Structure formats: structure tokens, C-alpha cells
RNA sequence: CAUCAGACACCACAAAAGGUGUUAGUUCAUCUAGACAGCCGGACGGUGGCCAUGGAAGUCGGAAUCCGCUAAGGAGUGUGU
């Protein structure tokens, strides 16, 4: 019991991120290029997967 | 007690800024910026000092603190 | 005297009213039989705007234009057995879908009778509404009787 | 048909200016589709409500300096979430219908224009 | 393309006075004083009047123009911080173990002590930076409030308090415990 | 601007594929006929449309994919139940 008004905030900080494909790096949920240089600033992104 | 933003009083290029030519055939004479072409070239003529109207670089000339 | 307003729904003859009408001082089983006197023509799925005032169930019937177009259609079914869709396409009613749809409280903000007669005459997706044509492409040709209802 | 729709807007604004003489600019902000629908149904007799792009109205009045230049006194008042009411009733009845009806807890009239002049009404 | 001049206009309210000598920027007003060293950015300030200061970059590239606009935002942030302030309402998020937070003074540093996070036995301690104060709100359960003048101090101490409670070797999206920044507002209660 | 810079034949190496790094360009469209972005508000009615009826109203599912008001609102983008 985390009272989901709070759990939406924790999911803003932990769940609503996108993830780069090549370098697995956590990203802002509306980004278009991964910020890292080791993946080459690629534009291949996916959502971080929700629970169940 | 006010805003103490200081100056940085540059001397600006403008139409009619008078300039001192140092390198070339004119070699230390006065002329005036007629119309500035672009970021680095100006257009000058110093007709009393004898130097003809010419496009010239801003490396070959130095801005003087006088204007008209 | 108090004010209670509910929206009863599609039922065959006497077809969960108790959960919506317990706090309005009315019945549950007698209120299910109280809506049978209105939706009994009218054997098509519609709504009923019930207005109960603190001591009795007084259900009224809301005028529905899609149910009025379904009242100008084929009624044949009884209950729970038509085995495919329980649907039926039927007769045209080229002028009967222009008087009844323009008399169902003049909905959709119509400024003409060809407006409501196309809004509730071209939304037919269960009936054909024509003898040699179809619906939803007769709105640009329905230009008759506009001055009569207005 | 954006060129077509905008030319249609020019044409209908030229139409509704040169057919009506009583203008009511209304300060209608954040008004719902339920309030406006009962404005569309109520005003079927005398008034014509016209919302839309007030900065498309800017060029619409810019091009209409030649014909009836007395509409030059409107573009300082087209600022704010305003709309047009086109009728021939001069002051009273339209201002009594717009402001008083359909209020809950913005429908006012901010400008009244009759044949060239402006009136507080 | 080498933009010939770009400029921004910093609005200055009544109660603050600024003081820019070459790029040291002092801003003094009704809550305190803020100073920011901007020697690394090469922009040109010009007072047009007491309420408006135009910053400008002459003959700059692209990154140089980006530096200009962020100079404007930095000066505006100091100005709104010394007029209004900043106030970050962080709120505790715990699953089963009630996170206990105190302030301790040790060697005059005023650490924020985080106890019993996830049922750990490790006592965490965060140094409170200079310029930020920490309160615990009335009649809203499990909240901490960090209010100060600088954006950088308040925000960086909020991030220190958040990220000292990262959950290790677990599924982070199941174990959501931590102290998370909820509201980012101003000290002045009218706004 | 390179938290593996690059540097002039033969000659002592580098590719496909990517980059909202940054400069230049091509085509088309919106473009001033005040757009884009953002903030404030609507996001209608026919309609719980036809239905499979414990329940389906945009939303476990299927097909038609309409009209009026419009300045604009989908027989609805997800959630909820």
C-alpha cells in the first residue's frame, strides 16, 4: 500500500523512462537521441517495460 | 544603489565611422566606412586623403574613435 | 417531496435497478415491473428517463431518434433466440423518418428539417431505409420538407 | 484546401460585414461546447455568432481598408478571447440575451459597434 | 552562419539591484545577496535602464548563442531566488519500513540523517549546503521541505537526498522506496 | 573540438550502417493568409447507434465508419470500471 498518488510519482522517477537499444542507458521518456556518445547518439529507443 | 552594469565601450563599425588604413598603398591614412559589406569587409573612401574607394578587409584597417 | 432522476435502459419485457434506486425511496422488484408499461411498438433498445419523487417510481420515456428509426424498422424477435445478430433491415420510410426524427426534441442543433432528417436518417447502420438505395449518401439529396417542420 | 478555406473565410467575412450593421464583440473565453450549442440553437432568429481566428481577422481588416474604412476601429479590440455577433438590432436585446443567459458557478459583450461609432451600451 | 548580434532582456523588479563588473554578477534584494561568476561564457551586459538589462553576443556561432540564452536564465533565476526564493517539497515514499529522517548537527555541518531506509542498518548522512534550510511540514504526513535562495544549492541538496536512497540489486520498479522531489515552487506563499 | 583529433602521393590500412555534433544544400508543404511550440478552455448531439446482454455507454468482441451545429469536437488515443 503505497497509495498510488505517491506511486505515480515514484514511477515518474523510476518507470517513465525510455531506454536506448544499443547502450541500455536510461533516458527521458520523450527523448529522440540517446545522450551517450558510446552508442553514437543513436535514435533507436524503447520504453522501459512496465510491471506485468 | 542601482544597476552597476559597467560599459564595455567598444568602438563600433557604422556608416561613417572613420578608419585608419595601415597596410597597403595608402599606408596610414584616413577614410570612412561607406557601407559595410559583411562580417569582415567594409567599403571605404578617403577622398581628401587621396585613397580611392575600395572594398577592404578589417585586418588592413583600424577603427578610430571619431565618427561622423 | 424530493427529486430523483434515473436513466433506465434496454430490456425486453421486464429486463440491476436496485443499486441505482435504493437511495431514492423507491422499489427494486416493483420498479423493474414499473418500466414494463412503457417499453412494451417500442420493443427496440432505448432509454427511459425515470423521475421518482420520494415515495413512488414514476418512470417516463426519453424520445430517442435512433430508437425512432428502429421503430421504423422490423421488430421480429422475441427474446434470446435469433442465433446470428438479432438484427433486421427493413422498409424505407422516406417521409416517416422525416417527421418523427424532426419531432424527437429537435436534437443535434438543427436549423432545418433536412438537417435532422439527415442526422437521424443517414446514421442508419442496421437498416437500409431505401427501396433502391442506401443510407449515409442521401444527405446531399434530401432537400424536401424543410419548410414544413420549421 | 487551406488556400480555399482561407479564401472562403475572406469571402464570408466580406459577406457578413457588408450585410449587417450591428456588431457585438464578445469576450468569450474558455466557453464550453454545451454553452455554445445552446447559443447556436437560441440565436436562430436575429443574431449570427461567429468565432474563429481573431488574427486571421487582422489581415481580413487589413485588406478591408478600402471598402467601409470605419471598421478600422476594431483591431485594438480584437485582442483578447473575443468573438463576433452580427445582427441588426442596435443595442438592447442582443446584449440582454448574450450576457444574462447560460451562466453557471465567460459570456459578456465587450464592444458594441453601430455604423461607424462605438457604444458602451 | 555567425549571427551578427543576439540579445536578451533581463527584467529587474524594484527591490533588487544588480552589479556586474566584468562578469562577476552580484544581485542584492529583499531576501539576501547572490553572486555568480560567469567568466567562462564571454557575453556582454548593457543596462538600458534600471529595470532592463540587455545581454548580447556579437558575432557568435551557435553554441555561443545557446550560452547567451542560458546566461539570461541564470540571472533570472538568481533574481527570482532573491526576491521570492525556492522551496522544494520532497515526500517520503516507503513500502513497509517507515523511513525516518532527522537533522543532526555534527561538527557544525548540519547533516540530514536517513535511518531505517528499506530496513537497512546503514545510517545515511547528507551535508546540507550553505544557503538551504530544511523543515518538516505541518499536517501532511511524511514530507520534507527544502527552502533556500539559490536554485543550485536547493536543487542539488534535493538530488543528494534523493539519490542517497537508490535501491541496489533489486528491481527498482517494484521496490519504489525513496525520497522523491514532489513540488518545485517558491517560498512566498502568495505565489 | 574529437574523455582513441588530423596532417598531403607511392608508403606503411580501414568498411557497411548510424548521429536534433555542426556548416552548406535540394524538394514539397504549412509560411506574413500572425503558423509552429508552450499556457488557459472546449473536446458537442443523434448514441447505452446495430449487437453477441449478468454486464459493452469509444473502449473482453464484430461490421458499417454517417449527419447536423460548427470555429471545433472520432459510431473516439489510451486509462478507468
From Swiss-Prot, chain A:
Coiled coil: none annotated. It is found in: Cytoplasm. There is a cross-link at residue 17 (Glycyl lysine isopeptide (Lys-Gly) (interchain with G-Cter in ubiquitin)). Disulfide bonds: none annotated. Component of the ribosome, a large ribonucleoprotein complex responsible for the synthesis of proteins in the cell. The small ribosomal subunit (SSU) binds messenger RNAs (mRNAs) and translates the encoded message by selecting cognate aminoacyl-transfer RNA (tRNA) molecules. The large subunit (LSU) contains the ribosomal catalytic site termed the peptidyl transferase center (PTC), which catalyzes the formation of peptide bonds, thereby polymerizing the amino acids delivered by tRNAs into a polypeptide chain. Component of the large ribosomal subunit (LSU). Mature yeast ribosomes consist of a small (40S) and a large (60S) subunit. The 40S small subunit contains 1 molecule of ribosomal RNA (18S rRNA) and 33 different proteins (encoded by 57 genes). The large 60S subunit contains 3 rRNA molecules (25S, 5.8S and 5S rRNA) and 46 different proteins (encoded by 81 genes). This is Large ribosomal subunit protein eL40A. It comes from Saccharomyces cerevisiae (strain ATCC 204508 / S288c). The chain holds residues 77 to 128 of 128 of the full protein.
Curated annotation (Swiss-Prot), chain B:
Signal peptide: none annotated. It is found in: Cytoplasm. Disulfide bonds: none annotated. N-terminally acetylated by acetyltransferase NatA. Component of the ribosome, a large ribonucleoprotein complex responsible for the synthesis of proteins in the cell. The small ribosomal subunit (SSU) binds messenger RNAs (mRNAs) and translates the encoded message by selecting cognate aminoacyl-transfer RNA (tRNA) molecules. The large subunit (LSU) contains the ribosomal catalytic site termed the peptidyl transferase center (PTC), which catalyzes the formation of peptide bonds, thereby polymerizing the amino acids delivered by tRNAs into a polypeptide chain. Present with 45300 molecules/cell in log phase SD medium. Component of the large ribosomal subunit (LSU). Mature yeast ribosomes consist of a small (40S) and a large (60S) subunit. The 40S small subunit contains 1 molecule of ribosomal RNA (18S rRNA) and 33 different proteins (encoded by 57 genes). The large 60S subunit contains 3 rRNA molecules (25S, 5.8S and 5S rRNA) and 46 different proteins (encoded by 81 genes). Belongs to the eukaryotic ribosomal protein eL14 family. This is Large ribosomal subunit protein eL14A. The gene is RPL14A. The chain holds residues 3 to 70 of 138 of the full protein.
From Swiss-Prot, chain C:
Its main location: cytoplasm. The modification N6,N6,N6-trimethyllysine is found at residue 3. SUPFAM superfamilies: Ribosomal L11/L12e N-terminal domain (SSF54747), Ribosomal protein L11, C-terminal domain (SSF46906). Although not reproduced with a second method, methylation at Lys-3 cannot be ruled out. It is found in: Cytoplasm. The keyword Transferase does not apply. The modification Phosphoserine is found at residue 26. GO terms for biological process: cytoplasmic translation; ribosomal large subunit assembly; translation. There is a cross-link at residues 117, 133 (Glycyl lysine isopeptide (Lys-Gly) (interchain with G-Cter in ubiquitin)). GO terms for cellular component: cytosol; cytosolic large ribosomal subunit. Keywords: Cytoplasm, Isopeptide bond, Methylation, Phosphoprotein, Ribonucleoprotein, Ribosomal protein, RNA-binding, Ubl conjugation. InterPro entries: Ribosomal_uL11 (IPR000911), Ribosomal_uL11_C (IPR020783), Ribosomal_uL11_C_sf (IPR036769), Ribosomal_uL11_CS (IPR020785), Ribosomal_uL11_N (IPR020784), Ribosomal_uL11_N_sf (IPR036796). The modification N5-methylarginine is found at residue 54. GO terms for molecular function: large ribosomal subunit rRNA binding; structural constituent of ribosome. Component of the large ribosomal subunit (LSU). Mature yeast ribosomes consist of a small (40S) and a large (60S) subunit. The 40S small subunit contains 1 molecule of ribosomal RNA (18S rRNA) and 33 different proteins (encoded by 57 genes). The large 60S subunit contains 3 rRNA molecules (25S, 5.8S and 5S rRNA) and 46 different proteins (encoded by 81 genes). Present with 68500 molecules/cell in log phase SD medium. There are 2 genes for uL11 in yeast. Belongs to the universal ribosomal protein uL11 family. The gene is RPL12A.
Curated annotation (Swiss-Prot), chain D:
There is a cross-link at residues 12, 95 (Glycyl lysine isopeptide (Lys-Gly) (interchain with G-Cter in ubiquitin)). The modification Phosphoserine is found at residue 66. It is found in: Cytoplasm. It comes from the Eukaryota. Component of the ribosome, a large ribonucleoprotein complex responsible for the synthesis of proteins in the cell. The small ribosomal subunit (SSU) binds messenger RNAs (mRNAs) and translates the encoded message by selecting cognate aminoacyl-transfer RNA (tRNA) molecules. The large subunit (LSU) contains the ribosomal catalytic site termed the peptidyl transferase center (PTC), which catalyzes the formation of peptide bonds, thereby polymerizing the amino acids delivered by tRNAs into a polypeptide chain. Component of the large ribosomal subunit (LSU). Mature yeast ribosomes consist of a small (40S) and a large (60S) subunit. The 40S small subunit contains 1 molecule of ribosomal RNA (18S rRNA) and 33 different proteins (encoded by 57 genes). The large 60S subunit contains 3 rRNA molecules (25S, 5.8S and 5S rRNA) and 46 different proteins (encoded by 81 genes). The 5 acidic ribosomal P-proteins form the stalk structure of the 60S subunit. They are organized as a pentameric complex in which uL10/P0 interacts with 2 heterodimers, P1A-P2B and P1B-P2A. uL10 directly interacts with 28S rRNA. Belongs to the universal ribosomal protein uL10 family. This is Large ribosomal subunit protein uL10. The chain holds residues 3 to 199 of 312 of the full protein.
Amino acid at each position: 500500500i503505497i497509495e498510488p498518488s505517491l506511486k505515480a510519482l515514484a514511477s515518474k522517477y523510476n518507470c517513465d523512462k525510455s531506454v536506448c537499444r544499443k547502450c541500455y542507458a536510461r533516458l527521458p521518456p520523450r527523448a529522440t537521441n540517446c545522450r551517450k556518445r558510446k552508442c553514437g547518439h543513436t535514435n533507436q529507443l524503447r520504453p522501459k517495460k512496465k510491471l506485468k | 544603489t542601482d544597476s552597476i552594469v559597467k560599459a564595455s565601450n567598444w568602438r563600433l563599425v557604422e556608416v561613417g565611422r572613420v578608419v585608419l588604413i595601415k597596410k597597403g598603398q595608402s599606408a596610414g591614412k584616413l577614410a570612412a566606412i561607406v557601407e559595410i559589406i559583411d562580417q569582415k569587409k567594409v567599403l571605404i573612401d578617403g577622398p581628401k586623403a587621396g585613397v580611392p574607394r575600395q572594398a577592404i578587409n578589417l585586418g588592413q584597417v583600424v577603427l578610430t574613435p571619431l565618427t561622423f | 417531496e424530493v427529486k430523483y432522476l434515473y436513466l433506465r435502459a434496454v430490456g425486453g419485457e421486464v429486463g440491476l435497478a436496485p443499486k441505482i434506486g435504493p437511495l431514492g425511496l423507491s422499489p427494486k422488484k416493483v420498479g423493474e415491473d414499473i418500466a414494463k408499461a412503457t417499453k412494451e411498438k417500442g420493443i427496440k433498445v432505448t432509454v427511459q428517463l425515470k423521475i421518482q419523487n420520494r415515495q413512488a417510481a414514476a418512470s417516463v420515456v426519453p424520445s430517442a431518434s435512433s430508437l425512432v428509426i428502429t421503430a421504423l424498422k422490423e421488430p421480429p424477435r422475441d427474446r434470446k433466440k435469433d442465433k446470428n445478430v438479432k438484427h433486421s433491415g427493413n422498409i424505407q420510410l422516406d417521409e416517416i423518418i422525416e417527421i418523427a426524427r424532426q419531432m424527437r426534441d429537435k436534437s443535434f442543433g438543427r436549423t432545418l428539417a433536412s438537417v435532422t432528417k439527415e442526422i437521424l436518417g443517414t446514421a442508419q447502420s442496421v437498416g437500409c431505409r431505401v427501396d433502391f438505395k442506401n443510407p449515409h449518401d442521401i444527405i446531399e439529396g434530401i432537400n424536401a420538407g424543410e419548410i414544413e417542420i420549421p | 484546401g487551406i488556400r480555399e478555406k482561407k479564401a472562403e473565410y475572406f469571402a464570408k467575412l466580406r459577406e457578413y460585414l457588408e450585410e449587417y450593421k450591428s456588431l457585438f464583440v464578445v469576450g468569450v473565453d474558455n466557453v464550453s461546447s454545451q454553452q455554445m450549442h445552446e447559443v447556436r440553437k437560441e440565436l436562430r432568429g436575429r443574431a449570427v455568432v461567429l468565432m474563429g481566428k481573431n488574427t486571421m481577422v487582422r489581415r481580413a481588416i487589413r485588406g478591408f481598408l478600402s471598402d467601409l474604412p470605419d471598421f478600422e476601429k476594431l483591431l485594438p479590440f480584437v485582442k483578447g478571447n473575443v468573438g463576433f455577433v452580427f445582427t441588426n438590432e442596435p443595442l438592447t436585446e442582443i446584449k440582454n440575451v448574450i450576457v444574462s443567459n447560460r451562466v453557471a458557478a465567460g459570456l459578456t459583450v465587450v464592444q458594441v459597434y453601430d455604423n461607424g461609432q462605438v457604444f458602451p451600451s | 552562419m555567425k549571427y551578427i548580434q543576439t540579445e536578451q532582456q533581463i527584467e529587474v523588479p524594484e527591490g533588487v539591484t544588480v552589479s556586474i563588473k566584468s562578469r562577476i554578477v552580484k544581485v542584492v534584494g529583499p531576501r539576501g545577496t547572490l553572486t555568480k561568476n560567469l567568466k567562462h561564457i564571454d557575453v556582454t551586459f548593457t543596462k538600458v535602464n534600471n529595470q532592463l538589462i540587455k545581454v548580447a553576443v556579437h558575432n557568435g556561432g551557435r553554441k555561443h548563442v545557446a550560452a547567451l540564452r542560458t546566461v539570461k536564465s541564470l540571472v533570472d533565476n538568481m533574481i527570482t531566488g532573491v526576491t521570492k526564493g525556492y522551496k522544494y517539497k520532497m515526500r517520503y515514499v516507503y513500502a513497509h519500513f517507515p523511513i525516518n529522517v532527522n537533522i543532526v548537527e555534527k561538527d557544525g555541518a548540519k547533516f540530514i540523517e536517513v535511518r531505517n531506509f528499506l530496513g537497512d542498518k546503514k545510517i545515511r548522512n547528507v551535508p546540507v549546503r550553505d544557503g538551504v534550510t530544511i523543515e518538516f511540514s505541518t499536517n501532511v504526513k511524511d514530507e520534507i521541505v527544502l527552502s533556500g535562495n539559490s536554485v543550485e544549492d536547493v536543487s542539488q541538496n534535493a538530488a543528494d537526498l534523493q539519490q542517497i536512497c537508490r535501491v541496489r540489486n533489486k528491481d527498482i520498479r517494484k521496490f519504489l522506496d525513496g525520497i522523491y522531489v514532489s513540488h518545485k515552487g517558491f517560498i512566498t506563499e502568495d505565489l
